[PDB]
Amino acid sequence: GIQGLAKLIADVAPSAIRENDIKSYFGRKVAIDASMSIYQFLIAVRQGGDVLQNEEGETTSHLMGMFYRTIRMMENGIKPVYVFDGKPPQLKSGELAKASERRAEAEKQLQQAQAAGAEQEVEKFTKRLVKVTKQHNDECKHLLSLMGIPYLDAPSEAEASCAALVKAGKVYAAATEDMDCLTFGSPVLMRHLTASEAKKLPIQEFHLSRILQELGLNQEQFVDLCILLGSDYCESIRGIGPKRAVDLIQKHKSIEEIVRRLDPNKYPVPENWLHKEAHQLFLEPEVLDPESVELKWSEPNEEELIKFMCGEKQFSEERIRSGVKRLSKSRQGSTLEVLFQ
DNA sequence: ACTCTGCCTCAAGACGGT
DNA sequence: TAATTGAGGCAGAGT
DNA sequence: ACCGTCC
Ligand SMILES: [K+]
Ligand SMILES: [Sm+3]
Ligand SMILES: [Sm+3]
Ligand SMILES: [Sm+3]
Ligand SMILES: [Sm+3]
Ligand SMILES: [Sm+3]
């Protein structure tokens, strides 16, 4: 993500944040960062500090949420396409190594609480070690196929390919919490689109054109702003936060110019700073071709979903059948069958 | 006064009967 | 064979 | 809407 960008928008560019009722999105298509939704379910969907699972010990929390949340979206006429990450870019390797440190230390502190018969400490580092695996992604892809819900494999970061689907008009918005989707150029970003019966947070749209207008920037200047704020791909400047970062971009436009005019003794830049390379990655990321695959929402295969979710993963047959019926009727009401001419 | 850093914590789902 | 993110809150120090 | 339960 971008450190503090959502807060900056809310304070400087509030006009870019628009809220609408779930009832207004009937018929709209959205792109979803699948990995983040899977992670949300593995973290939250716990029963007694442990995850849901079948008797074979195979985890099912990700299948639980993917199934029901996706159905709820379709009942509201919202048609999602799930986008899965691919090979991370090299620039992320500098940050990937720093993540393993946190997992290594979280593992060290895990067995410590275990050998110490702790209770709340076990549930503390356990959730901190959660991670989305290839088997998590493959099982969700398998589920979506049976549900008739489309998905796409991005060549690199899913966030970037979601944005490219919006640019191309193949979906209305990227439904995510990772604000760096705007840094990748997404015209629209939607938060809090869960279609949950609770309705605790309002559906927010972030319109990039509004952000650029109220900040007085173009896209390249907005990317440099996000770099100074803090991105996954390179270092920021120590002592330059969201307040000074805005004033500098608005005044000097480019980081290259900010360095020329900054006092090297007062605000020294990082050593071997890759702000140019991250700039190139945000503006011209490796993305799928939106014109290659035509997004279709298809009839779900009920009998295979029962065999998979119930026979194998041990979901309630009554609940799964009911879910597939809802999914099939809601698709019939929001989706036109294919026509030939 | 304003701003930034480095700490700290906390939460992160959904169904169906009541 | 995976590497969130986000939001606040607080004290303390730099501008 | 609350809350035990989901697997
Ligand atoms: K910084
Ligand atoms: Sm990201
Ligand atoms: Sm099995
Ligand atoms: Sm990602
Ligand atoms: Sm990241
Ligand atoms: Sm089995």
Author numbering: 2 to 342
Relevant lines from the article:
The structure-specific nuclease, flap endonuclease-1 (FEN1) plays a vital role in maintaining genome integrity by precisely processing intermediates of Okazaki fragment maturation, long-patch excision repair, telomere maintenance, and stalled replication forks. FEN1 preferentially binds to double flap substrates with a one nt 3′-flap and any length of 5′-flap, including zero. Here crystallographic analyses uncover an unprecedented electrostatic steering of an inverted 5′-flap through the human FEN1 (hFEN1) helical gateway.
To obtain structures of hFEN1 with a ss 5′-flap substrate for insight into ss 5′-flap selection, we crystallized three hFEN1 active site mutants D86N, R100A and D233N with a double-flap (DF) substrate and with Sm3+. In the hFEN1-D86N and hFEN1-R100A structures, the ssDNA (5′-flap) region of the substrate threaded through the tunnel formed by the gateway/cap. The overall inverted flap orientation resembles the hFEN1-R100A structure with the +1 phosphate remaining within 7 Å of Arg104, but shifted towards Arg103, presumably due to Arg100 removal. In the hFEN1-R100A structure, the scissile phosphodiester bond was ∼4–5 Å away from the metal ions, although −1 and +1 nts have moved towards the active site and away from the template strand. The −1 and −2 nts display less base overlap (stacking), and the +1 and −1 nts are no longer hydrogen bonded to the template strand (4–6 Å apart). Notably, as duplex DNA is not shifted close to the catalytic metal in the R100A structure, this structure may represent a pre-reactive substrate form. Its Tyr40 stacks at a 50° angle with the +1 nt and resembles the other hFEN1 structures, suggesting that the Tyr40 rotamer is linked to shifting duplex DNA into a catalytic position. On the basis of the hFEN1-R100A structure, we mutated three basic residues (Arg103, Arg104 and Lys132) positioned to guide the phosphodiester backbone and stabilize the inverted ssDNA orientation.
